[PDB]
């Protein structure tokens, strides 16, 4: 009794129109007139709350921007003035037909102003070095959009595929994204070189930006 959800990604300018659709295969309306479909929001680190119940009814502490519409087999969650807080994954859930199922979700991304990242770099600690390992960390802080290039250079000699990138959930307040690029080496390999450099290409920057440091210095 699958309840397919569309779209799969939804970009929205804050202050403007969001709408998403839950579409079932069997009907969801009981003979009492009530449609047993619920809408939930899920911010990525955090437990899901309940937004909408019975297709149209807002749950406790849910602002009037969140409106529920639909009947029977077709349903629509609508957001009329998107705050950056609405950046989450939205799930429909049918409660009429056994077994009760979730939709696969709809991701809301907020399209904000272009923001250049702050670029930082951290050398490995001497403590980690004593343990036989060196992690060098590049940090990309508070930028939009999410798409960025991070390129490692060692003694101006340019590496591939020894780095691991991680990126955060879109910020609930600033709608920005933040990224880390970690380069991990053995202590000997790290000691064999001097200059470690993180070269960053992003839209907010006209010029690619390199953050470098000299080992032992």
């Amino acid at each position: 009794t699958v309840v397919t959800q569309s779209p799969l990604s939804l970009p929205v300018t804050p202050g403007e129109a969001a709408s998403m659709s839950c579409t079932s295969t069997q009907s969801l309306r009981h003979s009492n007139g009530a449609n047993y479909l619920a809408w939930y929001q899920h911010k990525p680190g955090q437990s899901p709350r309940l937004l909408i119940r019975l297709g149209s009814q807002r749950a406790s502490g849910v602002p009037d921007r969140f409106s529920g519409s639909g009947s029977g087999t077709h349903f629509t969650l609508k957001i009329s003035r998107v705050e950056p807080e609405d950046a989450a994954i939205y799930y429909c859930m049918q409660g009429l037909n056994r077994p009760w199922t979730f939709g696969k979700g709809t991701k809301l991304e907020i399209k904000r102003t272009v923001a250049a990242p702050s670029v930082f770099i951290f050398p490995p600690s001497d403590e980690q070095l004593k343990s036989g390992t060196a992690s060098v960390v590049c940090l990309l802080n508070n930028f939009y959009p999410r798409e960025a290039k991070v390129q490692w250079k060692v003694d101006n000699a340019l590496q591939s595929g020894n780095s691991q990138e991680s990126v955060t959930e879109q910020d609930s307040k600033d709608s920005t994204y933040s990224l880390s690029s970690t380069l991990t080496l053995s202590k000997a390999d790290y000691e064999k070189h001097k200059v470690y450099a993180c070269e960053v290409t992003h839209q907010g920057l006209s010029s690619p930006v390199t953050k470098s440091f000299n080992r032992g210095e």
């Binding site: 009981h30 003979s31 009492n32 009530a34 047993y36 619920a38 939930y40 899920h42 680190g45 437990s47 899901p48 709350r49 309940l50 119940r53 019975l54 749950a59 406790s60 799930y91 859930m93 409660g95 009429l96 056994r98 077994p99 009760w100 199922t101 979730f102 939709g103 696969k104 979700g105 702050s118 930082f120 770099i121 951290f122 050398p123 490995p124 600690s125 403590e127 980690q128 343990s131 992690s135 960390v137 940090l139 802080n141 691991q164 991680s166 990126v167 955060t168 933040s178 880390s180 970690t182 991990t184 953050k211 440091f213």
Partner: protein
Amino acid sequence: QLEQSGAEVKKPGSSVKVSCKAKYDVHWVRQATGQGLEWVGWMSHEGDKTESAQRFKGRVTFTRDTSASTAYMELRGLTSDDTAIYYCTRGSKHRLRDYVLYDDYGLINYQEWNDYLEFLDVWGHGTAVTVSSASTKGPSVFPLAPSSKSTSGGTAALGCLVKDYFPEPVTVSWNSGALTSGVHTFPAVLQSSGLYSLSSVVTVPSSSLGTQTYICNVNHKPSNTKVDKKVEPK
């Protein structure tokens, strides 16, 4: 919120018992790795009904204690598909009469009752369960020290590299919960060691670097380990 039992790593083929603790319909939902929310199971407040999704019949068991405070999800024959964050939640249901079927004679007296899920409102923080033959390990924590290479204008960045642990998750607080704004804890990445690693960074005013003490607090429940690290300027 409902307090849940601690995260664990479990052997493929073994079973996990997840607790949920504040009368209420209790539902068990889960989120597997790289997957949407999935309905696992429920126990009715009446205590008449226990039921599960199709892939879970034979493997699952729902209980609640004598004093009715704590609910319990047992899941058996664990596979790598069962690697997920398991949420307990409370639920509202309608138990309606759909139709009645009777005769004059006094023999046939059918009447169909069914349960219909209205909502799940109050969720537990969740219990991460990782299925693996690998032994658990606490994390090594190293200072990501504030320098000239980590300052922008009058804003320095600092933090803690949390590294070589298993399994997920770790919880990173700063100054025992006092400092809560400006914190980024990145999603961990599995290294070639088959262990996890992430960084927790904080952006702060550079005129605090002498004045304020910054300490990352790392909690790893599966390894029964907590690591506090103080991060000083280079």
